[PDB]
Write a protein that binds this DNA or RNA. Structure first.
Ligand SMILES: Nc1ncnc2c1ncn2[C@@H]1O[C@H](COP(=O)(O)O)[C@@H](O)[C@H]1O
Ligand SMILES: [Ca+2]
Ligand SMILES: [Mn+2]
Ligand SMILES: [Mn+2]
Lengths: 612, 627, 616
DNA sequence: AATCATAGTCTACTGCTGTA
DNA sequence: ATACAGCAGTAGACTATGAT
């Protein structure tokens, strides 16, 4: 009934609590009993692993503490933005501030609700300006107890965290509590996709095992995204996407259903069951194709048909850049050897004969180089682990929204990548979270999918008000932080996508009478904290004075001078509050309220809480 | 091919080894640290004091206040240039390992050229084979290199003691002085305790070697950083001790080197006034002032221009501060052409002499600053006149014009091409090297150094070493010809004084200039029984044969000596013993089994050798077979 | 209710269960403990055991397959195939092969969970291990619990590779490189152990081999694996990897010259645009080499602009319009000084006026092929290669020869030792046969293969009782095709000269079997630092049979006489091809004669000083 | 005393390739 | 098609500082 938000935590506080609460048999008056937990494991037919390995880093216990620590900030709304015609009825959210603190506020209302996560965290190249920075000021004695480590070990860690470091340990201390929280927000079937490069791929993989468990590893994608012609040993032209899940609850297969032209060509392929002989099937299809050709983009080169469906021709028979396999192919009609590719074939003779059996080879009218049949039914049939998509288009996408700026953002991801991942992993519904917004690519992709593909996704994106580099394009154009640039990108991307809009929220410092802003800050903070989504409306209640607020059957009395107490007692419908939260700084009137509400709860219950 | 055993070298090995008589190797309680760290070699102040006094006495070193100090772990060895100080300190590393099990050493060098030369030698197969035979040990070398946690340090600290390996850290002054060694890391070394390279190296309890101690002045930064390692003992090696001694244990001077003919003699050539000072860019000439970068004339000075100004930097790398001068007659085309022509004529006089003898391949080294077609002309001409391997060598020298060839990377390339240059298969004998690369030359077959566009002992030392024959073996009395400018006239007088000053006294009048027994008599009589008839007997060679008809018979001879000399692992002992005396492992073991003694140390092995040799001479059946 | 409890443990403590959903007891126990040094490290139980394994000395000897090596094809062969444990085999190479290897390619077992990988070795008691490793008895008990029993965990896998990678590093030339094939199972764990053994600064890069086509329904379609690359010393490593003999480049220079000899002026380009318009699609990556003149086919390189930031701003004057040419959006990449040099060299392509940004004339003959990070090559071709070698079905997931061929060409440049200590099927060795018979190419291969028995399987049904037998045969067949290049066979032998440490008849040796005698000579020559390719010549010393190898002379046989000694001194004096500097003799077969050899090697002249070594 | 070293910043540039 | 600008680009020259 009496609560002060936000309570001290350690590196095992919450973990050690869950164990006592769920396994009281395994705890003695005293410490843990190994044999009792081992007895419960052997019973559920679970074997004992021979595994004994770890990636230890400097700041591991520190990272473990920050994961357990409660928020040290408050939450406010940007009411100027969220009252604009386009943005008021929106289900999409853009949050300002440190992602770790934003994720910690979200736990209470969003736990086990996120369908997909996509993040582009700092790669920690030797030139992205990555350093570990905290805005925390613990004493070595505080860290020693909370950690718990010794005073000298505690001193070593704070020396490290304030240094600030660009090392693997610095990067891991930073990443660990962000993924640890994000995992709590994701549904059991929910997926996390993480962009990374050679700098932290091994470290990322191992920390995800420590956070999700290796059995929940879906796989790793290589995004072959650029060309590099600088003289080196290896010409590095790819990047990585580590994918994990919350796996026993995950769908057996991922399939993209974003192409209406594929489905059309699949339907039209089958549909032509009436015509069987050829050229008659190719007579009837060509006639149809010549008319509908332009309505088929990007599948508009699929001019042929056979018993198995519509297909196109592929020049992928030759060996690229290298000499291949030399053999002869005899033309089925001219009975002469076919024109050989300048670099020979991609595949040996034995392979070529098997494709010629399955009639997967296209010949010219003459003995013209052969081609391969590529069917429309097959078009985006799988999520290959190697993605060939030139990330230069990010510049095109951004130059379109910001024609005034030469280079708006340093190294931005393409919509085309995020678009693809969402479409295979999801089925047009759920929350899509990006707590490393940057340019705002994820959010923009959600605007695009719901607009063209008619999907029902909600985006939640987080970005830190990190200053714009002095003298840069953003700075020159008046963009003081990266957040001001992100916000604007989402504003311009909304105008181009039927004005779906988005709401804005921002982290606030914590804290003798209140100011009005401070009053709005506690209200927004309390409603999220109590388990209400930031899209749930906070109805204003006027009990004589008053001025109360109701959110999901929870009544708030922050305002001072509460008399009026009989107005709340009278409700009449639709009013039915099962919880009463009122600001503690605003005794007998308080004792009377708890006394009256107990007498009003029969029949039939309405509780009470005295907050801060 | 490694020379064993040179007396002037073995003397220095023994002089450092004698300091540690009665020393005790103390292992740590920590089972983890025992495998990575060195044993603590502890011995009393009196012991250490007495060990030094006895070494000084034996070596003929004055036991003065300036030569000894019992409150200092610094041991000093003084060896002149070209006497093999590197081989000596390496052989000592193997001896401190044999006797005490010290397996971790830091070799501190002051320069990249010495670092490249020290490492090259340490990694060479000839060194590896030499030391594996004599000690059944392998040296693992960790070279500290600037990256343009150090891997060499991690690996050296982390390397296991578990028993055929000695671990050695080679590091230069620039790296000792780098913040890379003072810094804290995320990584822990030595049973995950030390996050700093210096704390990790200190914990290894190292034995430190200092190459050229005059380049590490005790009061200065480099030396203060070496002090941070809290080293067990420091052994300094060089020809210059500009800050005196700490504990002088061995001294082989420049006069001893030249006198005992352990080094080549000198034959100086002086090839025959003006000065251009840098005023403020204004340059004053005394033989008028000129402004200013373009080519410097101002005279006839060939091929020289200004590159940087603030100090003025010349095209050959000569940095001039306001007040620095340069004689413009040094850069004269005729003076060089003359020096180069003279060295060529003198080389072929030495070539036809050495290549018509086993043959020795001579080399001429020219020192440039930054005409070239003349050299070929000169060689070709002198070859066609002088027309039998040297007949075919001159024929190849006429058929081709590849008889001549030309900073850290450049020194490595010199050291790489070393075995190639000495090979009688290739015609290259003339070398053109920039003055800046001089530190990378120490080739025994260099018989002529010619300073073209230019301590005298240090510069002659690049060609002082005794040459190697066609079978890559040192010759068992040669001279290095040195070519200087008109500017250096006092050369032989100034060098002869420099050699004397550095060192009853010496030095040889000819060296540097301008160009018990009664038993032996019985044996000599046993073999023996104008150009004179006596010459034919005194020049007829024979080979010793020991007339012992059984191993059981030999066993009894070694047993008698063993019992007469009663007043004096076991596996490693017998192995070291057999290799010295030479007698069968089984017959040595058989006698020791019978004998009423009990084993096991290096002192015992050294007594059996010296003793059994004397016994063998004093007694008796033996022979001489005509070879 | 029991399953509900287990689900709470998995829901709140996921890292406490391994990849196979098995319980990691120690991970939950370390969470329960909140009592009072943290550092950056990949740690596993068995790290101290792996460190020991690498420092433990060889327990074996080496000998030749005399039958195989004496065959005309194999005779003077520069190629080696070694039978035995790769760790033991690498330890014997140290004295002769450190640091001499230019490239190492290895295909180790992945930890797929379907490949049958289990840690197992020959070797201790918990008392014994605790002493040697220098660790507490509980750790020596915990290690042996996994090394003796069946383990397929990351730690068991790391215990297996560590000493192998540790010893291999020693064999690597400073300018040398290692290439390691792996898949997603151990990629991060190996990469982290390579960081330990080689240093992170020596990582070259990782290659992505897209080698499969999987159409079976899944979340991610796994169609790739990796090749991790490291160097011994990043500083001594060649700054660039390029091929100057590309197939596309060679075709275009041929086509260029063919057209150049048949057509002259404006006709040359019209005739070329015709063949180019039709073939362009097959020309990658030179598909924009549209232009041609008498010096060959060329491109307009639209590579004058500055990447990412603001560049050099200056005027480039058009030669006809005499106005400044259109400037790239970011300005130039070249300073005026370099631009002026390119203009004088006539490397600049101008438009018909100043409104066109300049280009650089770049000819197809000047094309150098780089190593791209993503390689597309179907791995299933390894079945075709092997059906052609063994026309039996399925004898070995073998690697195709088309993969390592390019890596060997890039790392090495026509010369160098290529080492594979997980031979597999013999792919790397085969690749050296194919590369060498196109030259200027003469690499030498050294491959190691354990005598692990064939499973019932096709190999067993054909008479191949060990993987080594199939490997030896594959190389024989691959050598027969590829012009009889041949290779020498070597194998590990039990150490017959060993005894349990004692001292009282201890030294009372058995007469050497003619086979034992040959095993000693072979081992001694390698131990002494001579490469297995160096020849051992038979020397006659007054009837006595000796052997000369790399300046060292071996006297193993008993009955060495005073005549043999005089003939030895005579052969040094007379024979011009006889220059030994070291004399090694077998102790057991030699005291009076032993002393006689020493005295004679000091007293006599030549002018070489011969050292005298005793062995066994 | 005139170089020689190390670490770190930032000049001076790669060459094929997506999209309009 | 021709053409601009793409490349979480690279290698190594050059600078400050400090050693002997
Ligand atoms: N006894 C020796 N025989 C041949 N070369 C030697 C000998 N001692 C030293 N050296 C070489 O001479 C060089 C001297 O360099 P430094 O370390 O300055 O003394 C060493 O790097 C060795 O390569
Ligand atoms: Ca990239
Ligand atoms: Mn380590
Ligand atoms: Mn897997």
């Amino acid at each position: 009934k009496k609560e002060t938000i936000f309570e001290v935590e350690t590196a095992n506080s919450k973990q050690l609590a869950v164990l006592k609460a769920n396994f009281p048999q395994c705890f003695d008056n005293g410490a843990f009993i190994q044999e009792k937990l081992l007895e419960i494991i052997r019973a559920s037919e679970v074997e004992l692993s021979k595994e004994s390995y770890s990636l230890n880093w400097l700041g591991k216990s520190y990272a473990r503490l920050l994961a357990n620590l409660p928020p040290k900030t408050l939450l406010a709304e940007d009411k100027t933005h969220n009252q604009q015609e386009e943005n008021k009825n929106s289900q999409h959210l853009l949050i300002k501030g440190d992602n770790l603190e934003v994720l910690k506020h979200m736990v209470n209302a969003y736990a086990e609700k996120v369908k997909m996560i996509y993040i582009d965290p700092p790669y920690n190249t030797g030139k992205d300006g990555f350093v570990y920075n905290d805005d925390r000021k613990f004493t070595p004695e505080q860290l020693s107890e909370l950690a718990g480590i010794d005073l000298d070990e505690a001193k070593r860690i704070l020396e490290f965290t304030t240094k600030g470091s660009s090392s693997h340990s610095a990067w891991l201390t930073f990443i660990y509590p962000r993924l640890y929280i994000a995992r709590e927000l994701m549904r059991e079937d929910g997926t996390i996709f993480i962009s990374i490069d050679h700098n932290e791929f091994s470290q990322l993989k191992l920390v995800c095992d420590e956070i999700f468990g290796e059995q929940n590893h879906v796989g790793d994608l290589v995004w072959k995204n650029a060309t590099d012609n600088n003289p080196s040993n290896i010409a590095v032209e790819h990047e990585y996407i580590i994918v994990y899940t919350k796996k026993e609850q995950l769908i057996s297969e991922w399939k993209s259903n974003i192409s209406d032209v594929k489905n059309l060509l699949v339907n039209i392929g089958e549909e032509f069951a009436s015509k069987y002989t050829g050229n008659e099937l190719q007579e009837k299809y060509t006639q149809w194709f010549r008319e509908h050709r332009s309505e088929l983009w990007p599948l508009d080169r699929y001019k042929y048909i056979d018993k198995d469906g519509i297909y196109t021709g592929s020049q992928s028979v030759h060996n690229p850049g290298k000499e291949g396999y030399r053999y002869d192919i005899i033309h089925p009609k001219t009975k002469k050897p076919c024109k050989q590719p300048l670099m020979g074939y991609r595949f040996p003779l034995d392979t070529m004969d098997r494709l010629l059996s399955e009639e997967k080879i296209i010949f010219g009218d003459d003995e013209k180089i052969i081609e391969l049949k590529v069917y429309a039914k097959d078009y985006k049939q799988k999520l290959s682990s190697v993605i060939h998509l030139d990330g230069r288009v990010a510049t095109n996408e951004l130059k379109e929204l910001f024609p005034e700026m030469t280079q708006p953002f340093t190294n931005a991801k393409t919509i085309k990548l995020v678009e693809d991942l969402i479409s295979f992993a999801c089925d047009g519904e759920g929350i899509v979270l990006d707590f490393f917004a940057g340019s705002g690519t994820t959010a923009h992709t959600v605007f695009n999918l719901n607009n063209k593909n008619k999907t029902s996704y909600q985006f939640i994106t987080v970005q830190l008000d990190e200053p714009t580099k002095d003298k840069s394009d953003a700075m020159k154009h008046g963009y003081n932080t990266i957040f001001d640039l992100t916000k604007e990108r989402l504003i311009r991307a909304s105008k181009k996508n039927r004005d779906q809009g988005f709401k804005v929220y921002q982290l606030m410092p914590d804290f003798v009478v209140l100011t009005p802003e401070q009053y709005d800050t506690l209200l927004t903070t309390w409603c999220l904290y109590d388990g209400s989504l930031l899209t749930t409306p906070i109805e204003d209640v006027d009990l004589g004075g008053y001025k109360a607020h109701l959110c999901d059957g929870r009544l708030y009395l922050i305002a001072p001078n509460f008399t009026a107490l009989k107005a709340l007692l009278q409700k009449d419908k639709d009013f039915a509050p099962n919880k009463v939260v009122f600001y503690g700084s605003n005794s007998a009137k308080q004792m009377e309220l708890n006394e009256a509400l107990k007498s009003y709860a029969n029949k039939k219950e309405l509780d009470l809480v005295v907050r801060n | 091919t490694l020379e064993k055993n040179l007396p002037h070298q073995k003397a220095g090995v023994d002089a450092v080894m004698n300091v540690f008589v009665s020393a005790t190797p103390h292992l740590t309680d920590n089972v983890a640290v025992r495998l990575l760290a060195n044993p603590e070699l502890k011995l009393s102040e009196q012991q250490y004091y007495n060990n030094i006094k006895n070494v000084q006495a034996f070596n003929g070193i004055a036991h003065s206040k300036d030569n000894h100090n019992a409150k200092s772990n610094i041991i000093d060895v003084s060896m002149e240039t070209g006497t093999g100080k590197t081989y000596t300190y390496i052989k000592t590393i193997f001896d401190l390992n044999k006797s005490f099990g010290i397996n971790k050493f830091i070799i501190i060098v002051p320069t990249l050229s010495i670092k490249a030369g020290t490492v090259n030698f340490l990694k060479s197969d000839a060194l590896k084979e030499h030391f594996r035979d004599d000690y059944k040990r392998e040296l693992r070398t960790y070279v500290v290199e600037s990256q343009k946690m150090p891997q060499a340090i991690h690996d050296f600290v982390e390397a296991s003691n578990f028993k055929k390996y000695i671990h050695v850290l080679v590091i230069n002054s620039g790296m000792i002085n780098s913040k890379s060694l003072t810094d804290t890391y995320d990584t822990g070394l030595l049973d995950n305790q030390f996050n700093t390279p210096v704390d990790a190296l200190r914990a290894v309890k190292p034995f430190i070697i200092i190459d050229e101690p005059h380049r590490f002045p005790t009061g200065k930064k480099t030396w203060e950083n070496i002090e941070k390692f809290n080293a067990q003992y420091i052994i300094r090696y060089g020809a210059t001790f500009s800050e005196g001694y700490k504990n002088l244990v061995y001294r082989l001077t420049a006069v001893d080197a030249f006198n005992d003919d352990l080094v080549k003699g000198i034959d100086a050539y002086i090839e025959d006034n003006a000065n251009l000072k840098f005023v403020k860019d204004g340059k004053e000439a005394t033989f008028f002032k000129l402004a200013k970068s373009l080519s410097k004339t101002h005279s006839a000075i060939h091929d020289l221009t200004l590159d940087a100004l603030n100090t003025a930097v010349l095209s050959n790398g000569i940095e001039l501060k306001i007040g620095s001068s340069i004689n413009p007659y040094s850069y004269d085309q005729t003076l060089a052409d003359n020096m180069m022509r003279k060295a060529v004529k003198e080389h072929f006089k030495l070539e036809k002499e050495l290549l018509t003898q086993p043959r020795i391949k001579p080399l001429t080294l020219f020192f440039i600053d930054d005409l070239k077609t003349k050299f070929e002309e000169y060689v070709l001409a002198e070859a066609n006149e002088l027309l039998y391997k040297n007949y075919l060598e001159k024929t190849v020298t006429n058929i081709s014009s590849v008889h001549g060839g030309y900073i850290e990377q450049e020194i490595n390339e010199i050291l790489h091409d070393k075995e190639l240059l000495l090979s009688l298969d290739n015609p290259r004998r003339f070398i053109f090297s920039k003055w800046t690369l001089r530190e990378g030359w120490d080739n025994p077959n260099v018989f002529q150094i010619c300073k073209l566009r230019s301590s005298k002992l240090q510069e002659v030392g690049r060609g002082l070493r005794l040459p190697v024959n066609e079978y890559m073996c040192r010759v068992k009395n040669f001279t290095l010809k040195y070519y200087v400018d008109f500017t250096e006239k006092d050369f032989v007088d100034s060098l002869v004084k420099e050699v004397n000053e550095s060192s009853p006294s010496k030095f040889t009048q000819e060296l540097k200039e301008q160009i018990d027994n009664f038993k032996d008599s019985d044996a000599y009589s046993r073999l023996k029984s104008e150009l004179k008839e006596l010459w034919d007997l005194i020049n007829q060679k024979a080979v010793i044969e020991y007339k012992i008809n059984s191993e059981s018979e030999f066993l009894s001879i070694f047993k008698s000596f063993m019992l007469e000399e009663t007043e004096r692992s076991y596996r490693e002992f017998l192995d070291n013993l057999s290799q010295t005396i030479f007698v069968k492992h089984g017959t040595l073991h058989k006698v020791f089994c019978d004998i009423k003694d009990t084993i096991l140390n290096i002192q015992t092995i050294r007594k059996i050798k010296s003793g059994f040799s004397k016994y063998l001479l004093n007694n008796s059946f033996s022979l001489g077979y005509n070879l």
